[PDB]
Amino acid sequence: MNSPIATVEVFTLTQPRKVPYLGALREGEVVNPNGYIVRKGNRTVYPTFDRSVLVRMTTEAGTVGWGETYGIVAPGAVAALINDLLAGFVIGRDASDPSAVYDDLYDMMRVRGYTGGFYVDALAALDIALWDIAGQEAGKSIRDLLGGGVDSFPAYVSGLPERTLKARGELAKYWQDRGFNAFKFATPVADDGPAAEIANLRQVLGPQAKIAADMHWNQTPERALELIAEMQPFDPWFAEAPVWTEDIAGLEKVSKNTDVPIAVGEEWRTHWDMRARIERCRIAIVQPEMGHKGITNFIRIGALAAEHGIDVIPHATVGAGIFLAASLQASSTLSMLKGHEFQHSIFEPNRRLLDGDMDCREGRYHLPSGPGLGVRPSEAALGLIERI
Amino acid sequence: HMNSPIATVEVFTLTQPRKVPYLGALREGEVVNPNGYIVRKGNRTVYPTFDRSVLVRMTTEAGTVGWGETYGIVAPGAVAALINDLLAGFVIGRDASDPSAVYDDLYDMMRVRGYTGGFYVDALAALDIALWDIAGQEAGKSIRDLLGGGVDSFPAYVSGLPERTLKARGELAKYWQDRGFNAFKFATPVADDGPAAEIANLRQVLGPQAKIAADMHWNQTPERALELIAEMQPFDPWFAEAPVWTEDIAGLEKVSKNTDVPIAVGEEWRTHWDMRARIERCRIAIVQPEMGHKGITNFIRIGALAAEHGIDVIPHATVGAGIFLAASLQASSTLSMLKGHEFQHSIFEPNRRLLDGDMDCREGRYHLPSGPGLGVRPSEAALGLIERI
Ligand SMILES: [Cl-]
C-alpha cells in the first residue's frame, strides 16, 4: 500500500572532513572569495568544503525516504528547482511506480533542453527518495524491488591521493594487501607522465593487478591515442575519459584506433547520453554516477549496457552515503556489473553520517540489510543538515 | 577605450502577467500547481502562468553598465544561485577586452561534471551578453561592429497565431501579411483538424508566394513525423521544425534523410557542440539558435559552423524583456548564413515600454538599435519592476 507524498524538504550537508584533491595545490592557484578554486591545470572548479544536497520526502502516512545529489557547487540551483518547480508535482503522487514519476518530471522541461545538468541532479535526489519510500512500503530492499541483486561485489581503488609517484605506489600496495585487485590513477598528476606512472604501478603491484588510467578529458583524440600507446605495454585495464565529453567524434576516433578498453560516463545523466556515444563509438565500459542520475536512470543505463554487452563499472563521489547506498542497491541488480569505484576518504564519512550496515571491507562492497535503501541519516547528520 | 575591470554583478527577475490568451491551449482540465505552473497534458511540458525572465546588471569599476538576460520562466532561482554563488566571483576582476575568453573559462569550470548545457549555459548566456554590452560601450561600438560589422535590418517571420479557430488564425495571418510580413509559422498541435488542414488554409489565405513553416513540437516518432510532413508537403511548407525529440538523433537522421522538406532545429540547444552532434549524422537545412539560452559567444560559433556547411540560420525568439532579443539581433546581423529571424509580435509590441533604445520591427523586417554595445537597456519603468534574486 502506497501513501501519497505529503512533503518534500531540501537540505545541504557540509562535512567536517575534506577529500583531498588529486593533484597538490601549486604556485599561482587562487582561492576565490566565494569559496571555490579553479585548478590552473584542468581549469575545472573545486569546492573548499565537501557538501551534498539531501532530500527528505515524507508520505501522508509518515513513511520517510531520503534522496541525495551533488551539492559541491551552487546547491541553491538544485534547491530552487525542487522548492519552486518539482516538489509541487511530486506531492500528491505516490511511490507505486517511481519511474513513472521520474518520467513525468523529466518531460516537463525536456523540449527546452534541460535534459541533463542540474535538472537531472534534482530529479536524481527525488527519484532516490521515492524508491526508498517504495521499498519501505513494500517491506523490501530496493534491489529486491528491482527483481533481486547480489549482496556483495568487488570494489576498486578509484584514486591514489598521495603527492608523489612513489607514495602513490605504496598506497596502492597497502590496498592490494587488503583485498583490492584493481586500481586507477589520474594521468595528469605524474610529473614524469602517465607512462612512467603506470610502469611504476605495474612493477609495484605485479602482473595480475588491474590498473586503469583516468585521462581526465583534456586531450585531443590524437594526443589521447599517443598517451594510450605509451601506456599500452604496461597492460592498462581501461583508459577512462580520453577526450572531452562533448567531442563524440574524437571519442569515436580514439575508441576505434586502440584495443585498450575505453570507459566513459560518470558525467552523463541518462540513457540518451549513452545512446549518443554507443551508436558511433567503441565503448567497453560505462561508469554511471548515481548522484547525478538516480535509480531510474541508473537501471536504464544498465539495461542498455546489457543489450550491447557493455561492462558497467559505477563511479563514486563523496557524499553522506545516501546516493552511494542507492548506487549499491541498483548496481547489485545489473548483469553487466564488473566493479564499483571506492576510495577510503569518499566512503568513510558515511560511517558517522549514516545509520545502517552498508560496508566496504577486504576489497568488496557489502549491501545493507533492510527495506528501501537500507540506511538513513544518523543523528549526527540530522544535526548538521541545514535547510535550503 | 580601455577596458575597466568588472566591479559588481547583480541578478534580478522581471515578472509580468501574460497579455496573450494562452490558457485556451489547456483542454483536459489542467490544474494550476504550486508556484503557478501548469502542465499541458497533450505534450507533458510545463508552462508558467506569467511572463518572467532573469536580468543581469554588470558594472565596471569605472561605471560602465551592461545588461544581460536569460530564461526565467521556470525556477529563476536556479540561474540566480549559479550566478550569485559561483559565477559572479569569477567575472569580477575580469574585463571585457575578450568576452569570449571569459565565457570559455566559466564554461570550463563545470564541463567535466556534465553541466554543458541547461541552466548552466542559461547563466553563462546572461553573463556573456552583459560582457559584450560593456565591451561595445567601452570601444564605443555596437556589438555587431565589434564583431566585424553587421547589417542594420533583416527579414522577420511571424509566429504566434493566438486565435481559437482555424479561420480566425488565417485572418490573423492575413493581417500581418497586410503589414508587410511574407513569412509565417504555425504550431502543428494547435489545429483540431490537423497540420494538413491548417497549412492548406494558410496557403490559400496567404497565397503561393508566402513562406509558411510548420513547427512540429517534437512529439512524434520519426515515422509519424514523416507521415505528417508528407501530408503537408503538397502545400509547400517553408520548413518542418523539430520533427522528433531532441534526444532522438537517430530519428532526426531518419526524418531528415527521407524528405526533401527542409528540416530546422536548434532552439533548445546551448552550444556548437549540440549542433556538431546533429549535423554529423543528419541533413539539417536550418538551425534556430535561441539567444536567451546561448549567449553571443555561443551564437556566433553556431553561425560560423553553419557557414562551414551551407546551413541557413533563422534564430528563435521568445518571451523576454528584449535584452537577449537585442543581443540576438546584434549577433545575427553578422552571420553570412542568416536568412531571417523569428518575430513574436505578441511579446515584442507590449514590451516596448520596458526598453530604452531603437530596436524595432516593421514591414516584415527587424531594425537594429543604433548605439554602442547592445543598443538597448531596461527603461525607467522596467527598473521600477525588477526584483533582486
Ligand atoms: Cl540543467
Ligand SMILES: [Mg+2]
Ligand atoms: Mg573519472
Ligand SMILES: [Mg+2]
Ligand atoms: Mg519551436
